[PDB]
Structures are given as structure tokens and as C-alpha cells.
């Protein structure tokens, strides 16, 4: 078995380190530049690779800066089998941060237009690659012009393989995944609104209702932790208090760690502790994806989990 991530809109993140705050209408000299991979699915692959668990990244990348993207992926130990879009470049996301502050300003390019041929190639690739014993994680919003209809086809193609399907998406894409029937979703506190019943005020009740259609339902609540519904049980997960530096990417780390736990057949409570420990470590870091495996293994032991009756 293996875990596949699907990144429909990959990116190359260029971290621009400056001194102090980012002042608009002013000159902000860059002290140093670092690179990381962009696209939620790739971040999830990076997390899985840190665990050493077998995984492969799928998606559509631009031909013009393919060597650069691949070089970054090798630095992250991410194995891949990307489809390539000729005459285009994988988008670049500029992330401005400082060793003096906690924030991060993100300036992302939108992404390119995927050809129908490549949309079709991805489906054929999934059909021949993915087996029922595998796990597939789709994360991140589709690139421009990759319609709801296209996403529906993608979800259906994955469902036909019998593989476990997890989706960390938002808006209409998240709504569709839930309607279609997926195994796992992790909307954060704001994203979950898209699938909430307006006439049902209680968040717990809404979660218990949605749990009827989703095997592993996680609603993440930032520093408050998360609430997870599984096998008719509801868990309130609380992380230990950590010194936050940058909570960007905390969700991607949570998803990667959660999936890793499931892949290793860890009981749901342990999987939740591992995911929470890893994401807590992430928030302690400057960038938007890194985390300390050492700190996480300890933090996992300081996560409280209480079943809500």
C-alpha cells in the first residue's frame, strides 16, 4: 500500500527574510532567500516523508521551471510522478518574514490553466496507479479554470479505485467532497461554515450530524485544538500551550500526521495526539511547513483528549 497526494495547483515558495515588519510603500531589503515547495498536497507529502512513510506526489506542474521544482522536492525527500503542462511555469508564492517578528505576509501567484489533455491524463494516471489498499489525499484549491465539474470527475475517479480518500479543501470543493462521499475532511473553524446547517446552531450537533456521512471528521480550531468524530464517538482534542511563531501550515502538518497515523493503524486517539503534537511543533517554527519531529514526539504526550458524551 502507499499514500498518494494530489496537488492540482503546485507552487514554488520563495521565503524572503527581511528585518522587522514589512512596511508598504517602503524598501524592504532581503537578508536572505530560501525555497520550499508550495501547494497543500506537496506540504502533506513533505510531512509524510519526514515520518519515512511511503508516499508519492501527483499533480500538474509547469515545464519551464520543472528542474527547480524537482530540486526542491528532492531536498524535501518527496517522490513524485507529476504530469507536465508545456509552455507554462509552476506558480511562485512569495512569503515575506523576519527573524525579528512572528508574522508572515503571503503574496501568491494564481497558477496556470491546465489543458484538458492533462486533466484527462491525471484521471487515467490515478486509475492505473491507485489500488484499493492505498490512501489518497487531495489538498488545496484547484488552479484557475479547473471547474467544479472537473473536481467531481477527479473525486469520482478516486472513489472508483476503492482507496481511502481524504480531502482538505474549502468552499464549494469541500461541499462537493462531502456530498460525493469521502473518508476524511479537516475544515478549520472558518471553512467548516460551508458545510454547516444554518438552522442548527450547535457546533457539536452539526459535527455529529455531518459525522453520519464522513468516517473521519476533524474540525480544527487553531490554538484550541480540534474536535474529531469517528465511529459514533466525539473527541475534544486540546494541545499543550506552545510559544506560537507562525501558525501557517499547522493544518497541513496536522493532515500529514493524521494520515500517517491511520496508515500505521494507530487507534484514533493516538492518531489525534500525534497530529496535534506535530502541528503544535509547526506553530513554533518561523516558516510555513517545517516542524521538529523530536519536539512533536514529546508534545504528543502532553495532548489531552476527552470524549464528549
Ligand X SMILES: Nc1ncnc2c1ncn2[C@@H]1O[C@H](COP(=O)(O)OP(=O)(O)OP(=O)(O)O)[C@@H](O)[C@H]1O
Size of the site for a second copy (CB under 8 A): 24
CB 55 within 8 A of CB 135: no
Q: How far is the CB of 125 from ligand X (least distance, A)?
A: 26
Measured CA to CA in angstroms, residue 140 lies from 17, 101, 151, 166, 224 at distances of 25, 27, 12, 12, 23
Among 71, 86, 107, 293, binds a second copy (CB under 8 A): 107
Cα dihedral: 199, 306, 266, 184 (round 10): 10
Among 11, 15, 18, 185, binds a second copy (CB under 8 A): 18
Integer Cα distance of 309 and 304 in angstroms: 16
Q: How far is the CB of 14 from a second copy (least distance, A)?
A: 8
On the CB side of 178, how many CA atoms lie within 13 Å of its CA? 26
**Partner whose binding site includes residue 117, from Mg ion, ligand X, a second copy, none (CB under 5 to 8 Å by kind):** none
Residue 24 as a binder of a second copy (CB under 8 A): the answer is: yes
Residue 40 as a binder of Mg ion (CB under 5 A): the answer is: yes
CB 181 within 8 A of CB 198: no
Q: Which of residues 230-259 bind Mg ion (CB under 5 A)?
A: 251
DSSP bridge pairs for 37: 12
Say which residues have a Cβ less than 8 Å from residue 267's Cβ, sequence separation at least 6. none
> Angle 250-263/40-51 helices, nearest 10 degrees?
50
DSSP state of 188: B
Size of the site for Mg ion (CB under 5 A): 5
**Partner whose binding site includes residue 53, from Mg ion, ligand X, a second copy, none (CB under 5 to 8 Å by kind):** none
Q: How far is the CB of 31 from a second copy (least distance, A)?
A: 8
Which SS3 state, helix, strand or coil, does residue 69 take? helix
Among 140, 166, 225, 261, binds Mg ion (CB under 5 A): 140
Of 200 and 226, nearer to Mg ion (C-beta) is: 226
Among 37, 61, 96, 155, binds a second copy (CB under 8 A): 96
**Partner whose binding site includes residue 276, from Mg ion, a second copy, ligand X, none (CB under 5 to 8 Å by kind):** ligand X
Which SS3 state, helix, strand or coil, does residue 217 take? strand
Say which residues have a Cβ less than 8 Å from residue 176's Cβ, sequence separation at least 6. 148, 151, 152, 155
Integer Cα distance of 237 and 82 in angstroms: 36
Residue 121 as a binder of a second copy (CB under 8 A): the answer is: no
- Phi, psi of 213, rounded to the nearest 5 degrees: -105, -10
CB 215 within 8 A of CB 167: no
Residue 33 as a binder of a second copy (CB under 8 A): the answer is: yes
Integer Cα distance of 299 and 238 in angstroms: 11
Q: Is 39 annotated as a binding residue?
A: no
Q: How far is the CB of 140 from Mg ion (least distance, A)?
A: 2
Residues near ligand X (CB under 6 A) are 188, 220-223, 225-226, 239, 242, 244, 247-252, 254, 276, 279-280, 283
Annotated binding site for Mg(2+): 212
Annotated binding site: 186, 188, 212, 220, 222, 225, 244, 249, 251-252
Interface residues with a second copy (CB under 8 A) are: 16, 18, 21-31, 33, 94, 96, 103-110
Annotated binding site for ATP: 186, 188, 220, 222, 225, 244, 249, 251-252
Interface residues with Mg ion (CB under 5 A) are: 9, 39-40, 140, 251
Amino acid at each position: 500500500s502507499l499514500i498518494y497526494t494530489i496537488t492540482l495547483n503546485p507552487a514554488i515558495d520563495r521565503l524572503l527574510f527581511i528585518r522587522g515588519e514589512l512596511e508598504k510603500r517602503k524598501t524592504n531589503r532581503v537578508i536572505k532567500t530560501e525555497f520550499d515547495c508550495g501547494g497543500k498536497g506537496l506540504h502533506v507529502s513533505g510531512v509524510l516523508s519526514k515520518f519515512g512513510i511511503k508516499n508519492e506526489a501527483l499533480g500538474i506542474a509547469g515545464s519551464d521551471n520543472l528542474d527547480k521544482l524537482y530540486a526542491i522536492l528532492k531536498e524535501k525527500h518527496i517522490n513524485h510522478d507529476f504530469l507536465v503542462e508545456a509552455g507554462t511555469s509552476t506558480r511562485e508564492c512569495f512569503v515575506v518574514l523576519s527573524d525579528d517578528t512572528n508574522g508572515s505576509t503571503m503574496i501568491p501567484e494564481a497558477g496556470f490553466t491546465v489543458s484538458q489533455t492533462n486533466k484527462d491524463n491525471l484521471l487515467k494516471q490515478i486509475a492505473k496507479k491507485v489500488k484499493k489498499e492505498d490512501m489518497v489525499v487531495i489538498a488545496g484549491s484547484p488552479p484557475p479554470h479547473y471547474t467544479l465539474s472537473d473536481f467531481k470527475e477527479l473525486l469520482r475517479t478516486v472513489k472508483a479505485t476503492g482507496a481511502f480518500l481524504g480531502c482538505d479543501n474549502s468552499g464549494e470543493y469541500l461541499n462537493l467532497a462531502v456530498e460525493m462521499g469521502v473518508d476524511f475532511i479537516k475544515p478549520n473553524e472558518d471553512e467548516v461554515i460551508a458545510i454547516l446547517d444554518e438552522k442548527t446552531n450547535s457546533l457539536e450537533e452539526n459535527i455529529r450530524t455531518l459525522a453520519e456521512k464522513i468516517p473521519y471528521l476533524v474540525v480544527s480550531l487553531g490554538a484550541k485544538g480540534s474536535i474529531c468524530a469517528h465511529n459514533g464517538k466525539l473527541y475534544q482534542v486540546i494541545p499543550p500551550k506552545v510559544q506560537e511563531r507562525n501558525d501557517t501550515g499547522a493544518g497541513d502538518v496536522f493532515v500529514g500526521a493524521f494520515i500517517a497515523g491511520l496508515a500505521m493503524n494507530m487507534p484514533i486517539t493516538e492518531t489525534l495526539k500525534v497530529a496535534t503534537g506535530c502541528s503544535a511543533s509547526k506553530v513554533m517554527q518561523q516558516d510555513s511547513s517545517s516542524f521538529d519531529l523530536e519536539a512533536a514526539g514529546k508534545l504528543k504526550n502532553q495532548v489531552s483528549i476527552i470524549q464528549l458524551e
